[PDB]
Amino acid sequence: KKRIINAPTLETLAMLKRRMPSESRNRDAIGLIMLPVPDLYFYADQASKSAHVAVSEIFGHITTLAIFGEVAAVNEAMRIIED
Amino acid sequence: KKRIINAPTLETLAMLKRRMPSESRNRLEMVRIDAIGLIMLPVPDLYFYADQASKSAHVAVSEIFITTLAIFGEVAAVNEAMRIIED
Amino acid sequence: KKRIINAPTLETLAMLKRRMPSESRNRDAIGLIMLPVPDLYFYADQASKSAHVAVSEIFGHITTLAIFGEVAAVNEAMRIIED
Amino acid sequence: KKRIINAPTLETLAMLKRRMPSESRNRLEMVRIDAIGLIMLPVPDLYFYADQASKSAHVAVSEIFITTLAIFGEVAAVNEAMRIIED
Amino acid sequence: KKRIINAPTLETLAMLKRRMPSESRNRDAIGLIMLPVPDLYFYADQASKSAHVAVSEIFGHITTLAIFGEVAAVNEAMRIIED
Amino acid sequence: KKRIINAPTLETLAMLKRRMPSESRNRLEMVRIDAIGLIMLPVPDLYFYADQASKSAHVAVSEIFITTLAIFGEVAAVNEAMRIIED
Numbered sequence: 269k270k271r272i273i274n275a276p277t278l279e280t281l282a283m284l285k286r287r288m289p290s291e292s293r294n295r296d297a298i299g300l301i302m303l304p305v306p307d308l309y310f311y312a313d314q315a316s317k318s319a320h321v322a323v324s325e326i327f328g329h330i331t332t333l334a335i336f337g338e339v340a341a342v343n344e345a346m347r348i349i350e351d
Numbered sequence: 352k353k354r355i356i357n358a359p360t361l362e363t364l365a366m367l368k369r370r371m372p373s374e375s376r377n378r379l380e381m382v383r384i385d386a387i388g389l390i391m392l393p394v395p396d397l398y399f400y401a402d403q404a405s406k407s408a409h410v411a412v413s414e415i416f417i418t419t420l421a422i423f424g425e426v427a428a429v430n431e432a433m434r435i436i437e438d
Numbered sequence: 439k440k441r442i443i444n445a446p447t448l449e450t451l452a453m454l455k456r457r458m459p460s461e462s463r464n465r466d467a468i469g470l471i472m473l474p475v476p477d478l479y480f481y482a483d484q485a486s487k488s489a490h491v492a493v494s495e496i497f498g499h500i501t502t503l504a505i506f507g508e509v510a511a512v513n514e515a516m517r518i519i520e521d
Numbered sequence: 522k523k524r525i526i527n528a529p530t531l532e533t534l535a536m537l538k539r540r541m542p543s544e545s546r547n548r549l550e551m552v553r554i555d556a557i558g559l560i561m562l563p564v565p566d567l568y569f570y571a572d573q574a575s576k577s578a579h580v581a582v583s584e585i586f587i588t589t590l591a592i593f594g595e596v597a598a599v600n601e602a603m604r605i606i607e608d
Numbered sequence: 609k610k611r612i613i614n615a616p617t618l619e620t621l622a623m624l625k626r627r628m629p630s631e632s633r634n635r636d637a638i639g640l641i642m643l644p645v646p647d648l649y650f651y652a653d654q655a656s657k658s659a660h661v662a663v664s665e666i667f668g669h670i671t672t673l674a675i676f677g678e679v680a681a682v683n684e685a686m687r688i689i690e691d
Numbered sequence: 692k693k694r695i696i697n698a699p700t701l702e703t704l705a706m707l708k709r710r711m712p713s714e715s716r717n718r719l720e721m722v723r724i725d726a727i728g729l730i731m732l733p734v735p736d737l738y739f740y741a742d743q744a745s746k747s748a749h750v751a752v753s754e755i756f757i758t759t760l761a762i763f764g765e766v767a768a769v770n771e772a773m774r775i776i777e778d
Binding site for chain 1: 352353354355356359360362363365366367369387389390391415417419
């Protein structure tokens with residue numbers, strides 16, 4: 269399903285970074301949502317067109333998208349994805 | 352499950368390029384990418400439909416790492432391809 | 439399921455070669471069929487006893503057999519496998 | 522599916538350490554390990570609940586290689602955490 | 609499910625060793641049982657508290673625990689795990 | 692799902708050898724391979740039945756990379772083994 273982490277720890281960020289591509293990693297709330305891969309890139313492209321949030325895949329098919337940004341924005345994004 | 356990205360970002364293209372073979376990467380600059388169709392297919396279908404697309408002008412195809420096929424090209428062509436694949 | 443590629447592109451061959459063992463790769467229609475592994479080797483052994491087609495596993499359990507040869511032969515093989 | 526190991530062996534700790542990131546390994550000596558809670562979670566839940574635990578005193582969390590979260594700490598804390606996760 | 613190998617061959621031991629961690633490998637009947645990972649470590653910890661049997665994961669989620677020891681002990685352990 | 696290859700090709704043997712451990716590879720020349728039985732088994736069954744076969748004369752066993760066991764030997768022996776495994 270979907271989940272939002274408000275005010276994540278440094279340790280939480282470290283865990284996520286280990287599970288992201290170097291390109292993304294090198295670049296607050298975090299929204300985590302499980303999506304099939306077409307949806308994943310569709311919704312990530314959305315965010316790249318949107319300021320104020322950053323996106324990345326999380327590894328582990330149906331995979332995980334992580335949305336990093338400000339509390340309002342992250343919530344807005346998770347809402348948009350539910351439609 | 353299928354999805355079409357209209358007018359993809361440069362970052363979107365970068366994300367996809369990271370997830371395709373080095374050999375396929377050049378094919379993106381040889382084609383106008385109005386749209387990207389992403390569809391999850393069993394492997395026999397994948398290569399069947401890729402081959403189709405490779406024969407078609409105006410689109411380029413690549414695997415993305417039941418797996419994912421990406422169809423790059425002009426809006427009409429991408430839409431046509433996704434339609435054909437639904438049949 | 440099963441599928442046959444008539445007159446494959448060079449790019450199509452390149453995609454398949456990336457997904458085959460070095461031994462096979464180093465060695466027109468292409469038949470692609472998804473089989474459990476016992477069936478896979480059973481039906482591939484058949485082809486090795488048969489002239490005019492070549493066989494290989496394709497990676498990605500239930501896996502994929504690829505049958506390379508002449509149009510008649512490939513069709514014949516895909517038919518035999520349906521029984 | 523969840524499980525709590527009360528009063529784990531040194532060998533049990535060794536087995537788990539082998540299956541966690543090198544970075545997490547030190548966190549075990551910074552905390553009294555009366556108990557270990559092991560629960561299998563989808564990844565969004567995993568990081569959600571880890572983050573919770575990392576904010577909580579008396580427990581430490583780590584991934585073990587839908588995946589596995591390990592919660593290390595004092596009996597009360599571990600039990601509380603496993604309870605919260607059931608909700 | 610579960611299975612017990614009485615008086616295993618050297619070849620059987622070799623096959624299992626290939627599929628265990630170096631740490632375990634470096635350390636008769638063999639009980640093999642498929643368990644979810646929480647159960648796995650729970651029941652392995654049990655064995656570490658118990659003399660006369662040794663435990664290890666076998667690789668290949670729901671994974672496999674291997675219990676090495678004397679015939680009585682191995683049987684006792686497989687019984688305990690059924691509860 | 693099970694299958695028996697009667698009178699396998701040299702190429703068939705080559706394909707299987709590529710997919711077994713280097714250690715197992717020699718065992719094929721120590722045994723007359725009239726037939727190869729291939730059966731997909733959960734891992735406890737795999738080692739249980741391998742061990743059986745390793746104790747039996749006239750067959751050799753190996754893993755092929757729920758996984759696959761290959762039973763190499765004489766037609767009678769292979770058939771007997773596949774039968775025993777159905778029980």
